[PDB]
Amino acid sequence: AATYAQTLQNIPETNVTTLDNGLRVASEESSQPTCTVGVWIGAGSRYENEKNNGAGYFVEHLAFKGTKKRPCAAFEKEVESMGAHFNGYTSREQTAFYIKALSKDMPKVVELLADVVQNCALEESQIEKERGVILQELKEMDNDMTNVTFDYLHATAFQGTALARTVEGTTENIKHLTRADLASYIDTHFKAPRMVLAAAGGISHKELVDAARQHFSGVSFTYKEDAVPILPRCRFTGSEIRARDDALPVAHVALAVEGPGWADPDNVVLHVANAIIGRYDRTFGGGKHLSSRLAALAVEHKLCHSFQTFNTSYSDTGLFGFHFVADPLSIDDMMFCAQGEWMRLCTSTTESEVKRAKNHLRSAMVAQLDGTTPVCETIGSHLLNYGRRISLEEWDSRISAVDARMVRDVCSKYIYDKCPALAAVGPIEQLLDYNRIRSGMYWI
Amino acid sequence: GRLMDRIRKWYYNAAGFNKYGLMRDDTLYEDDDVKEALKRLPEDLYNERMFRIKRALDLSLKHRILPKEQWVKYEEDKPYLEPYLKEVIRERLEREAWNKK
Amino acid sequence: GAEDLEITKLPNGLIIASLENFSPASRIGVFIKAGSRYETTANLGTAHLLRLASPLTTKGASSFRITRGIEAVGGSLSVYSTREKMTYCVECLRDHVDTVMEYLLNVTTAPEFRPWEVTDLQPQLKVDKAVAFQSPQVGVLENLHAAAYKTALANPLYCPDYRIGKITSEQLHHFVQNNFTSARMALVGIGVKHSDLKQVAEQFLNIRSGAGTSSAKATYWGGEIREQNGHSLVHAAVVTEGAAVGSAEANAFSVLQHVLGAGPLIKRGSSVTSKLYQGVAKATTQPFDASAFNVNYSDSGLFGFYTISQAAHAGEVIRAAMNQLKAAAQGGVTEEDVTKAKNQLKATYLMSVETAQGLLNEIGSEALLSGTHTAPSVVAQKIDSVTSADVVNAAKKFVSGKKSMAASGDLGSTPFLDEL
Amino acid sequence: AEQFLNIRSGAGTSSAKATYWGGEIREQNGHSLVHAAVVTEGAAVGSAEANAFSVLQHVLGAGPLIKRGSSVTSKLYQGVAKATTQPFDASAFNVNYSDSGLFGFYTISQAAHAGEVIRAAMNQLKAAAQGGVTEEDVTKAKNQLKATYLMSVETAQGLLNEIGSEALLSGTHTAPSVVAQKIDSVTSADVVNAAKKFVSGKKSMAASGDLGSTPFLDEL
């Protein structure tokens, strides 16, 4: 029937219209009876400081315990009773609160949203309860080696900067944050110019923006209020942090070099690169025949329980690396092979490899738009990061222009002979010496 | 044609491994393909091969052979491994070919 | 671009569903009526191993080519399965469907199950099973079906330990020959034109007609399996024989499900619309969780509640979960509760189809255990067309029926099925 | 004992009462042979009702007395024998605890015949609860029991065990003649009653092997 080329062109366009308060409203209308609308905010722990670190997270815990117009019980009951799903999150540079309901309620939803971001109750009795909850979630997350590792990776890769802090904050900050600090955080960061109301599913862009003009009022007076603040740059540091505990069953290791940041086109090539290396885990059936050389090796030599490549972007910087989980006695070989694959990227990539990496990448981007929430997540982000929507048709255009020669140059440029940042946790005695690792950074 | 079909029977007797009670396939040098092939053999075939070989080595250390009666007959020689070995090599050649592509 | 959902039904009983939504990606699948349900004490786990065997050499493609070939075009291949259905699906960009199709076809209709490949694969059941059982959630469900039945459905979904390494190429072959028959299979397929998906099903799907082995009836036992293992958290599930697939009493339970509460809708939020949750909430003080459990099978189903709670509070928490079911069977159901639920159920249903995976699953599930596609409006019409009485009856059926219970953790304070 | 033993006084922690559940635990593990045991709340130790069961034990049969020989004096054995054709084994199970006990039968049998073998073991218990006990059977048993008891004391180990068991859960030594007097002083009725108590009481069953053909407690 229709080709992949055409199906890409026939995808309904994303409509974006800015209000007067500076808020941007975007959406992708589909023929679906169900939908997702939410607000993506350009806020997060990176915008916090040493004293309010963990506020945005503390705010995430209250964002749902009721607003001033309608208290806790009232709020929950109203959302539940309409079959709507309310969820959200907060990262280092991005926060979001979105809802999943029937397109029929698109406007009632929008009203709830705006009520949440603009009128959080911040009930004093509630704050003391979420305080205990957050403290519990810290202990739980403390036992998730994978996140402990990426936190440490940031802690050191961006040591001495804002990006070095976790999203949840510190035990102290959480034990002492005040109704004020939270109020302040909200009043300081949740603002129209820094927000985006995105929606996907069966919704009328116009009905959306109308419902928007109506509930997102707050119109700024001074020039300060509608200017989006540029964050001080975060210095990257080649370094390592080793958290050793031989009593842990498996060791975790993450290694990364500094990335270019959202706006850079190279990110397209970097992602293609990560596709060549890819990922693995003992439950992949492909086993020894997987196309990923590292994957094959991991299998053939029982090198690890799993491994993943990543290219975490940020406004002005990022982290391009890989993370793996292995038994104490195979860390060394795994690391050896992994760095080996990075060196292959810079020096000897094949058209065959990229040809396949590109298809995997295409399927990946397409797979990220499987549903309303994921399409809505994309819009909220694309706007917040690129200041516009990049259609699959465009991504595909860019992805198709990537060739071996290009992968090598981009990779060489970001990986070859660079001081990486390393985080290791667990029974890591067999992994050793920054110096040795630093040498795995050159000569294929 | 049935020409060398005779030469073979001649060489077969010229070779002389049948005097040890070994099948042709028992005498193969165990390179990489042959090793994989052997791992695929059914238990019974494998154990029989094992005894045949251990037996041959014992005859060899003794400097004896089997009585003329026990010698494997050209036409009764079981090519028990050739089938597996043939598959192993194709699989390999497939991969080799594919990895170039 | 937006219309239809054709669905042929070839001479041999092989149903073919199809829908073109012009998505840049396709997702074809082979649904089958097979699973640990058709296993006998003699070949247990053979269905599980078959699930992991998807990448083994076939008569048309080799173990190597399957994986390399699919990955070459950025495709994927997976096998999902319940106690009575097995799906073999593949995804890929529109322009590669024909390529990925070969392997799909080969895997499901032409396996070879070479002894050596099969022997090397078995130690994998040990792994696969170990990661699954990391979720206590999965452990009690296994034991539930074992305490709720004497056969078929009583069979575990994960190969039992004693059988690892003992399954044979015979068993795999026989299992496939006796179940993967045209009258038990459906060739669904989103993102493709119906004529195309049909021309395929024809000229290639070899293993023809049949119904082969038929599962024994699902006899209900009503047992109580308890697992003392130390865990600070106790998972408990108390159920009763419920409605079956395509059962009129089904929609009734599904609604009683939401009324009692079936999963949170607000992150870290409390569930007020959840009677069961709210009930338990007032009973215990420490963290916990409680939900309405509901499974619908071909010739049976299970209904009840599931509860996670600190050991010392399992007592109070489970009782509370009970009192809340009895209170509901005695007319403790507002006409509004029934209204709210019906919406949550319709929404839940409607959202659970935005996923390419979710949609394909929906479409094919019907085209296999039916041969038709119930329109969304129809399923809606069937859902709300459920009286407040039907719901209080469903509840009754539970408080009355023979209960079977499965629990695991530090059961030192957990009640026995006969103390409820 | 005196001038030496020191950890002392009191009875410390006291065991919780023995609550009866009546469950059925089944273990599917492949074994060609299926072991099954169906019991009911029996009698406690020091109980008058004890001797009754012990005797019903021997009547039904509790272990062979002739090497490789068949057990004719064993009603249970003989019963099952007539039921199955393949090798098996069946015995009277009987345990007496401080505040409770268990009574029933135990049966080893080929998987495919566990059904017929366990049923048979049952019918033979019901048949006994319905007066299927000769006044002679009761006489034979009483002897096997007295002999068994008497022989089970020739061992230094067996004797010390006997002596100490009493001096702990009593503080006295029941003379052999007394225990004898207590044993035979068991009517043919007591025995048929014991049997009744089983066919009536709530049963709990434990089985393991290839249970593919083993019956569930509610199918007995």
**Distance between CA atoms of C243 and D71, rounded to whole angstroms?**
52
To the nearest whole angstrom, how far is the Cα of C27 from the nearest Cα of chain A? 11
Residue C73 contacts A, CB cutoff 8 Å = yes
The number of C-alpha atoms within 13 Å of C203 and in the hemisphere containing its C-beta is 8
In this complex, which of C95, C131, C345 lies closest to A4 when CB atoms are compared?
C95
* 3 state SS for C314-325: HHHHHHHHHHHH
The CATH homologous superfamily of the domain defined by B1-101: Cytochrome b-c1 complex subunit 7 (1.10.1090.10)
- Given the residues A29, A48, A60, A93, select the one marked as catalytic: A60
Domain boundaries, chain B: 1-101
In this complex, which of C64, C65, C116 lies closest to B40 when CB atoms are compared?
C116
Task: List the structure tokens of C266.
Answer: 């607000």
Strand partners, A86: A99, C266
CB D118 within 8 A of CB D38: yes
Place of tokens 């290639």: C204
* Strand A279-281 versus strand A95-102 pairing type: unpaired
**Distance between CA atoms of C326 and C396, rounded to whole angstroms?**
7
In this complex, which of C42, C150, C163 lies closest to D216 when CB atoms are compared?
C150
**Distance between CA atoms of C417 and C394, rounded to whole angstroms?**
20
Angle at A49 between CA A47 and CA A55, to 5 degrees: 75
**Distance between CA atoms of D43 and D193, rounded to whole angstroms?**
12
To the nearest whole angstrom, how far is the Cα of C358 from the nearest Cα of chain D? 36
Torsion of CA C36, C40, C45, C49, to 10 degrees: -80
In this complex, which of A32, A81, A86 lies closest to C340 when CB atoms are compared?
A81
Domains and CATH numbers, chain A: 14-227 (3.30.830.10), 239-442 (3.30.830.10)
**Distance between CA atoms of A304 and A250, rounded to whole angstroms?**
9
Please list the helix, strand and coil fractions of chain C in percent, rounded to the nearest 5, in that order.
45, 20, 35
CB-based contact C163 D30, cutoff 8 Å: yes
Give the CA distances from residue C97 to residues A27, C2, C391, in Å, rounded to whole numbers and listed in that order.
30, 20, 46
To the nearest whole angstrom, how far is the Cα of A150 from the nearest Cα of chain C? 23
Q: Which helix (H) or strand (E) holds A240?
A: strand A239-244
CB-based contact A77 C356, cutoff 8 Å: no
Residue of C39, C48, C38 whose CA lies nearest to C158: C48
Strand partners, A26: A16, A198
Task: List the structure tokens of C347.
Answer: 């929404």
Region of C20 please: left (phi>0), alpha (psi -120 to 50) or beta: beta
C contacts of B98 (beta carbons < 8 Å): 64-65, 68
**Distance between CA atoms of C342 and C255, rounded to whole angstroms?**
6
To the nearest whole angstrom, how far is the Cα of B11 from the nearest Cα of chain C? 34
Residues of D with CB under 8 A from a CB of C: 21, 23-25, 28-30, 210-212, 216, 218
* Strand A239-244 versus strand A421-426 pairing type: parallel
CB-based contact C64 B40, cutoff 8 Å: no
How many beta carbons lie within 10 A of that of residue B29, not counting itself? 5
Residue A60 a catalytic site member: yes
Task: List the structure tokens of D57.
Answer: 């034990």
CA dihedral (C270, C273, C276, C278) positive or negative = positive
Place of tokens 């410390």: D12
Q: Which residues of D69-107 are buried (b: 16+ CB within 10 A; e: fewer)?
A: eebebbbbbbbbbebbeeebbbbbbbebeeebbbbbbbb
Residue of A432, A431, A433, A429 whose CA lies nearest to A247: A429
First-to-final CA distance of chain D: 53
Q: In units of Å, what resolution does this entry have?
A: 2.8
CB C320 within 8 A of CB C282: yes
Backbone angles phi, psi at A117, to 5 degrees: -70, -30
- Kindly identify which residue of chain C lies nearest to residue D32, measuring between CA atoms: C42
In this complex, which of D21, D210, D218 lies closest to C41 when CB atoms are compared?
D210
CB-based contact C67 A8, cutoff 8 Å: no
**C–B contact (≥3 CB pairs within 8 Å)?**
yes
How many beta carbons lie within 10 A of that of residue C289, not counting itself? 16
Task: List the structure tokens of A150.
Answer: 């990426």
C contacts of D23 (beta carbons < 8 Å): 223-224
CB-based contact C163 D21, cutoff 8 Å: no
Q: What DSSP letter does each residue of A72-122 carry, written as one string? A: HHHHHHHHHTTT-EEEEEE-SS-EEEEEEEEGGGHHHHHHHHHHHHHHB--
A contacts of C91 (beta carbons < 8 Å): 363, 367
How many beta carbons lie within 10 A of that of residue C413, not counting itself? 14
Q: Can you tell me whether residue D172 is helix, strand or coil? A: coil
CB D107 within 8 A of CB D36: yes
Q: Chains with 3 or more CB pairs closer than 8 angstroms to B?
A: C
Mutate to test the interface with D, among C162, C171, C402 (most CBs of D within 10 A): C162
Q: Chains with 3 or more CB pairs closer than 8 angstroms to D?
A: C
Mutate to test the interface with C, among D24, D28, D219 (most CBs of C within 10 A): D28
CB-based contact B91 C64, cutoff 8 Å: yes
To the nearest whole angstrom, how far is the Cα of C271 from the nearest Cα of chain A? 8
Domains and CATH numbers, chain D: 20-220 (3.30.830.10)
Structure determined via: X-ray
- Kindly identify which residue of chain C lies nearest to residue D29, measuring between CA atoms: C162
Residue of A88, A96, A92 whose CA lies nearest to A47: A92
Give the CA distances from residue A115 to residues A87, C129, C377, in Å, rounded to whole numbers and listed in that order.
15, 46, 33
CB A66 within 8 A of CB A119: no
**A–D contact (≥3 CB pairs within 8 Å)?**
no
* Strand C25-32 versus strand C224-228 pairing type: unpaired
Mutate to test the interface with B, among C59, C62, C67, C117 (most CBs of B within 10 A): C62
Place of tokens 């929906």: C362
**Distance between CA atoms of D165 and A94, rounded to whole angstroms?**
75
- Residue at D87: amino acid letter: P
CB A89 within 8 A of CB A60: yes
Angle at A309 between CA A307 and CA A312, to 5 degrees: 135
To the nearest whole angstrom, how far is the Cα of B92 from the nearest Cα of chain C? 10
Q: Can you tell me whether residue A226 is helix, strand or coil? A: coil
Helix axes A351-367, A392-401, angle to 10 degrees: 170
CB-based contact C115 B42, cutoff 8 Å: yes
- Residue at A313: amino acid letter: S
In this complex, which of A61, A81, A291 lies closest to C268 when CB atoms are compared?
A61
CB D206 within 8 A of CB D21: no
Q: Can you tell me whether residue C385 is helix, strand or coil? A: coil
Give the CA distances from residue C139 to residues A366, A407, C107, C164, in Å, rounded to whole numbers and listed in that order.
35, 46, 30, 18
Task: List the structure tokens of C92.
Answer: 């890929």
Q: Can you tell me whether residue D7 is helix, strand or coil? A: coil
Residue C23 contacts A, CB cutoff 8 Å = yes
**Distance between CA atoms of D25 and C219, rounded to whole angstroms?**
18
Task: List the structure tokens of A48.
Answer: 């916090």
Task: List the structure tokens of D81.
Answer: 């024998």
CB pairs under 8 A between A and C: 150
CA dihedral (D157, D162, D163, D164) positive or negative = positive
**Distance between CA atoms of A372 and A378, rounded to whole angstroms?**
10
A contacts of C19 (beta carbons < 8 Å): none
Mutate to test the interface with C, among A102, A116, A363 (most CBs of C within 10 A): A363
The conformation of residue A153, written as its DSSP 8-state character, comes to H
Tell me the Cα Rg of chain B: 16
Burial class (CB in 10 A: 0-12, 13-18, 19+), A242: middle
First-to-final CA distance of chain B: 38
Q: Chains with 3 or more CB pairs closer than 8 angstroms to C?
A: A, B, D
Q: Which residues of C16-52 are buried (b: 16+ CB within 10 A; e: fewer)?
A: bbbbbbebbbbbbbbbbbbbbbbbebebbbbbbbbbb
D contacts of C166 (beta carbons < 8 Å): 30
Task: List the structure tokens of C389.
Answer: 């009485």
To the nearest whole angstrom, how far is the Cα of C291 from the nearest Cα of chain A? 15
**Distance between CA atoms of D148 and D134, rounded to whole angstroms?**
21
**Distance between CA atoms of C386 and A128, rounded to whole angstroms?**
43
Strand partners, C189: C28
**Distance between CA atoms of A285 and C121, rounded to whole angstroms?**
10
Residue of C49, C46, C108, C110 whose CA lies nearest to C77: C108
B contacts of C64 (beta carbons < 8 Å): 91, 94-95, 98
Strand partners, A196: A24, A40
In this complex, which of C75, C128, C268 lies closest to A283 when CB atoms are compared?
C128
Q: What DSSP letter does each residue of A324-374 carry, written as one string? A: EEE-GGGHHHHHHHHHHHHHHHHHH--HHHHHHHHHHHHHHHHHTTSSHHH
